[PDB]
Design a protein around this ligand. Structure first.
Ligand SMILES: [Cl-]
Ligand SMILES: [Cl-]
Ligand SMILES: [Cl-]
Ligand SMILES: [Cl-]
Lengths: 173, 173, 173, 173
């Protein structure tokens, strides 16, 4: 490569693996959003929350691929596994699955940052810090906030709580 | 007729029958809206939902009659039966009655489309596809969404749920 | 299902298969665009052409999934295979691969339309006609136009022709 | 020094050396731009590309000197060697010389970042990451893109290709 400089094969491969994880996550969120759009589920704010994340994770994959080419590495795509479930249960089940997913993406980001630091690759480390690490902390905190509000609304009237959360916390129209 | 071309007597008669079904449906929705406007029912958003449908079905009848004349057929009006009930129960009872009504209109549209296809009447088939079939699918999906949200709000506090649905899902002011 | 009407299991399954084909096509176009963004390929207009198609096919999948729920069918996601190549050759090779891909999507659309017609499902047939069939004919014609212009530019100076096509036909900035 | 804190003599000296390298690079780009402004070379877009880089590297030197004073180190200027050539050959020769120059600046940035990390100087490390490392990766990728387009335009008509690149890729007016 005419441009490649200080860009390890190990980082290049790890970035391709992270692209796969982000595209998997995008696909998971597409499925989550369409489940909440079912006529027998019908939680518009929950659907929009997950569709926005489907877009956000697709965009994250695109930013990683752009950076891979900026560094002179080679994008290599692998098959994308389907999401872990076909039906996602309640809003609570779905938000628990989402925070498990985000903690897995966050650990992959942290592992790649540690590899970049071991390889003395400061551009990689800055790239993750600037575009991914804080967005992940902010999203995980938001999902934690939502889990707490969903949990306080269960009481002995789960349907009422699930409606109210969707109506009064999540964005709809 | 100086204009009539490729317009069967069978289609002409079926369009007149469909006009009757749409005017019946308009009348049903007028009754539903006035029931929810009673001082002892008093669900403004439910009343407005059904009054909008009373208008929409009157408009559908007018569009069918306009098309009948565009094709050179003859509008023939029949008596309009009163709605099936004088009192419509809860919002849930009313939305169940509405989706039964809309599935009956949808089946009549589908039957007329099948007659038009058998008669090789593409203008009729396009007319229904362009003005009626998707509006019916979209409305039935919306009513299904509403039925699911109404059902989740019943719990053991039916009055509370019925208020909240009207306040937080249906349009009022 | 509380809403499902005139929606066959055969159509429901075929729509899920078509979603998979559109998401595969989106993924193919993501790969095509990133190949042309390589520092050793560097054809900005070619990259933008394929990235726009990656978005367009993702959007097509979303519209099919929205329609599946509008009809009361159930979205079912399957694994997504990786694209057929890791490296896409010249602009000519890539545009030939794209028109093969689009003819495969077009045949799948035509097969689903024929199934809908056999099942007397006019909403399905109108949906494909209104959102997919003309967009596919227009795109395939555009790709044919581009293939002809690329082919006339090869001459005995392939590099010069490939540059000029990207500069003077495809959109860049 | 009344302000100096956590700022090693090693970093201070390395920053002064990097200032010299940036001012050398600015001077190289001044020479490159004036060569392409010759009446017997006459490639306006090539001249403007290199004059913009002459400004950019002067600005980089100024930012390093500002940071040196912010940290309480002392700017020390050394003689500036003349550029490596008086005549720069073709656009291809010149862009090859430019990417060699930029990889040398990038390695100096990476070496200073590694020194800062060894000295536990996070302000220095953040400063380079925020103002220099990504600007260098982006510029080197751009030069790689340009080298690929210049190389594809050589064919057996080098003059024609050199004109077309300057006219259709580089900014002029
Ligand atoms: Cl799997
Ligand atoms: Cl009666
Ligand atoms: Cl495969
Ligand atoms: Cl010298």
């Amino acid at each position: 490569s005419q441009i490649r400089q200080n860009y390890s094969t190990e980082v290049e491969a790890a970035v391709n693996r992270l692209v796969n994880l982000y595209l998997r996550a995008s696909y998971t969120y597409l499925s989550l959003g369409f489940y909440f759009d079912r006529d027998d589920v019908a939680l518009e704010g929950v659907c929009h929350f997950f569709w926005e994340l489907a877009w956000e994770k697709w965009e994250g994959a695109w930013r990683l691929l752009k950076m891979q080419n900026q560094r002179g590495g080679r994008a290599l795509f692998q098959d994308l596994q389907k999401p872990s479930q076909d039906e996602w249960g309640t809003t609570l089940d779905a938000m628990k699955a989402a925070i498990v997913l985000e903690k897995s993406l966050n650990q992959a980001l942290l592992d790649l940052h540690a590899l970049g630091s071991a390889q003395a690759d400061p551009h990689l480390c800055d790239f993750l810090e600037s575009h991914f690490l804080d967005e992940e902390v902010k999203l995980i905190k938001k999902m934690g906030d939502h889990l707490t509000n969903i949990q306080r609304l269960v009481g002995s009237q789960a349907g009422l709580g699930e409606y109210l959360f969707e109506r009064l916390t999540l964005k709809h129209d």
